[PDB]
Design a protein around this ligand. Structure first.
Ligand SMILES: *SC[C@H](NC(=O)CC[C@H](N)C(=O)O)C(=O)NCC(=O)O
Ligand SMILES: *SC[C@H](NC(=O)CC[C@H](N)C(=O)O)C(=O)NCC(=O)O
Lengths: 238, 238
């Protein structure tokens, strides 16, 4: 919600300076790391501007935002740059008022970061699973590894006996995990959660969250992206 | 300072419960990750107990502190477990009063975490360098890679024109990086900072810090450790 604009690529005008009272995020519509920070921006009700970046043909000026041209990057009114999706999310939460997403209790807050670490293998595994399916490979081994990681997550929800990873209602950790879980269906690996019932309840509960729901990707647009993407078609990155 | 005790290994008595008003850290005298958390414990003047763990022959009960028996682990009076050195350090800083090690400003705090990420390749590279030297390998390539990482760090200090990574005086980020820098000499890779003058000034400045100085390892004990270690001698882990 609010990121439906053409990407800027090589030869594009850099945006103006960030206006006072706004923060800016450099994103890309299909990037799960950027998705994570956009969820936090929305959930916290932060006034912001989304600038999409062309990852195949990056604007030369974009390397002045991140030395390797990665996304997400946050850029403030005072010229300050913040990156790593997790560092970005955490900064957003501390810097801005209203709803607090991380717990106040130091221990509870640490627990969520520990849960974040337990999840660390999932992003690259889902990616490897996708790449395998998209080349026609019998990706039984990667799926088996993903299922294990998801079993590790299931045991947390199951032990805590709460709907969300951080308790009875949604919080920071839930948004941090969300984007890869949204992608399972289109990735073709929704079956990797067939054995994890609390994860499946969590997925349902997440979709009902105002913020999660507002930012849900259109499934058919996303399928088109993946087709162009795996053909290395420049149109994917627009 | 305060970690000069025999390690507990297989068949060892587990320690009692953590007494009210104390936090406990599971460590090992030569572990750089644990060293990081001990520096924070000391710097914050936190009342604590250090329990050393035998990494070659782990106590069976230790898997009830960390599922893979890693260190450091913090254990509280209320039975709570916190791990990952960085998560531990961060929790310590938020939970305990007096001197604050991370900056108060959200942006400045985020910057330090960004500096921590820039440093991320250094631990395993220094380890690979050590392993290479200790088997008699012409480790020119690993040293070249380490030197690059150290050049990346030098440019930060140089751009900021301050002694410490977080400013004119010592702070959290400095303690987080410290342990690998202490180890360069005994590792045999002190020459990998020959080209980085602010890093070398920083190293000198760090050694003068009350906390850093208090926890400095004895060089000859450490050489003995490495000899036993690379011989897979059980005595290394005592
Ligand atoms: S989704 C696009 C890529 N983003 C990242 O992999 C950021 C990961 C960070 N670790 C994080 O923010 O958490 C991306 O920037 N791809 C462009 C590239 O050239 O790598
Ligand atoms: S120094 C001993 C080892 N510790 C770690 O590698 C912890 C690293 C974490 N990422 C961190 O705390 O930052 C260790 O626990 N070795 C024992 C083993 O069997 O791996």
């Amino acid at each position: 919600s609010g990121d439906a604009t053409r990407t800027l690529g090589k030869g594009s005008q850099p945006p103006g300076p960030v206006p006072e009272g706004l923060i800016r995020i450099y994103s890309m519509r299909f990037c799960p790391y950027s998705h994570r920070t956009r969820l936090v921006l929305k959930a916290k009700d932060i006034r912001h501007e989304v600038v999409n970046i062309n990852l195949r043909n990056k604007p030369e000026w974009y390397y002045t935002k991140h030395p390797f041209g990665h996304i997400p990057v946050l850029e403030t009114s005072q010229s300050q740059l913040i990156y790593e999706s997790v560092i970005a999310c955490e900064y957003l939460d501390d810097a801005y008022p209203g709803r607090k997403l991380f717990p106040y209790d130091p221990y509870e807050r640490a627990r969520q970061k520990m849960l974040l670490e337990l999840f660390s293998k999932v992003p690259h595994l889902t990616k490897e699973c996708l790449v395998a399916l998209r080349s026609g490979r019998e990706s039984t081994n990667l799926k088996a590894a993903l299922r294990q990681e998801f079993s590790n997550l299931e045991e947390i929800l199951e032990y805590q006996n709460t709907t969300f990873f951080g308790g009875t209602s949604i919080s920071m950790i839930d948004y941090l995990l969300w984007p890869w879980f949204e992608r399972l269906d289109v990735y073709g690996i929704l079956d990797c959660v067939s054995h994890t019932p609390a994860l499946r309840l969590w997925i349902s509960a997440m979709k009902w969250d105002p913020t999660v729901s507002a930012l849900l990707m259109d499934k058919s647009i996303f399928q088109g992206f993946l087709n162009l993407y795996f053909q290395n078609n420049p149109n994917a990155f627009d």
